[PDB]
């Protein structure tokens, strides 16, 4: 019988309970978005990358949901290598940031994807 840890076990939603994704698994998740005609985009956060409540407390309001856009959504992107290249670029400029890949479905007109692609120092 093992006890689920309490310390330093913050999660980042979808796919964050699986072992970290390799470059190849990353590449396949990004191909899923492309094959569905969803637009990839990267987001990064240098401060705390989890939800909290600082500015308001009413139902449905949380701080920490929005992170900051790395450049712009990659419209007309056809190759996952383009996305992973930006991930590399973002990681170099922000080795200290949490970086996730998100996607937009301009047809349903909503963000439809969000998974952690890189976490810094022992997170």
């Amino acid at each position: 019988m093992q006890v689920w840890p309490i310390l330093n076990l913050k999660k980042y939603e979808t796919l964050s309970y699986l072992p970290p994704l390799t470059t190849d698994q990353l590449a396949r998740q990004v191909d899923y978005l492309l094959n569905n005609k969803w637009v990839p985009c990267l987001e990064f956060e240098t401060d705390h990358g989890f939800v909290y409540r600082e500015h308001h407390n009413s139902p449905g309001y949380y701080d920490g949901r929005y992170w900051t856009m790395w450049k712009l959504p990659m419209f007309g992107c056809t190759d996952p290598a383009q996305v992973l290249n930006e991930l590399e670029e973002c990681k170099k400029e922000y080795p200290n940031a949490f970086i996730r890949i998100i996607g937009f479905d301009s047809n349903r007109e909503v963000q439809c994807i969000s998974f952690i692609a890189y976490k810094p120092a022992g997170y």
């Binding site: 093992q2 979808t14 939800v51 969000s114």
Partner: protein
Amino acid sequence: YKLTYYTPEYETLDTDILAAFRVSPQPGVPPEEAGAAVAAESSTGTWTTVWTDGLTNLDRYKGRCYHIEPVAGEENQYICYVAYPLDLFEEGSVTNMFTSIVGNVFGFKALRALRLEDLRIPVAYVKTFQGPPHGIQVERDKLNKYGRPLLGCTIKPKLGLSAKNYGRAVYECLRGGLDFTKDDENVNSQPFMRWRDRFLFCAEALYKAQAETGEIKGHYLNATAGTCEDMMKRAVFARELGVPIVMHDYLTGGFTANTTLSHYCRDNGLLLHIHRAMHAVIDRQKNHGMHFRVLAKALRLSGGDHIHSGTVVERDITLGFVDLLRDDYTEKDRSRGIYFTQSWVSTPGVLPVASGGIHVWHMPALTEIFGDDSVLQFGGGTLGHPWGNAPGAVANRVALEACVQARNEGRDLAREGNTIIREATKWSPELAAACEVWK
């Protein structure tokens, strides 16, 4: 009746409320008369002539059986299509919609049985309702949860635990990776656990789990009560606590109270989880009652963000009403029990909730059948894990994510589901532990 109410030449208007009834007449009653009886009995139609009928134009208010078709493989059973003019209904009142259509006919002597199978709600009438307080896309944006089904855990036993012990179970469940915990439909306010104490301890537990994991959590706080006043007092305290979601048993509380709660949820930013307790009293038998798809459309109008919708794991009938709850437009499809094409003119969709005796091994099937936009509820499937709630929650969250990853990679969940689960047990001791207790 035959003469006035059976109108096979009738062209339905886009403003008409159309109904498909499964009619089983008494022997000796031909279909056309029965269909004419169903239409008259659910609209004008009086046993004797009255002078006041000459004061109006009753043709403009009558229900019209415009079509009849035999039911295959059944003896003496037909589907009769009835059209009701828009003017018969009170704007925004599901209560009146049901009273007008279903309030009187079912007791007709000439009928041996009667079942309402579907209703085509015209877009002009759809626009008079608020619909879901939030709906699928807004709920995902608020909770910041994308690309996978949501996970819930029903707390058991339903009765017997004190408020604090109940809250302890809530914390252990949420910290393990599930998104929501839930109050059983029976859990309102009782001697051993009054509602306010429950709300309060559940609030402490969910905030503790949210702070621990970094993920937004919620607990469906049951606001179902004996009066509108009591129900509103419970929802108001939820708002006060700043929590995300409340719950209502829409059939036992009723449509008038549900609509009130739905409007309050919209105005205060609360998500609304709907439980369908008592539905089987009405929708079970094929010969008499109302099919669940009709009750599902009603809920989408009155308002709710989640709606319990069974478990599949008649697949097709279920997938049919899942589309009716989620999509903006669903085309007529008899193979799926969809009798009418239905448009929603941008009314938000409702998240279907699968529940009932499910565990890790059903995960690939549930994901494949429902897709991302669903909530998978696990009671014993979590609270029955050998290492406790947190590990039970982790096993479920891991199995789900393994399935989503695999699907996204192009694997066939239908054919490889068991393998995807087995593969994850090699690195998840929690899942490995669950798999041993289950398949």
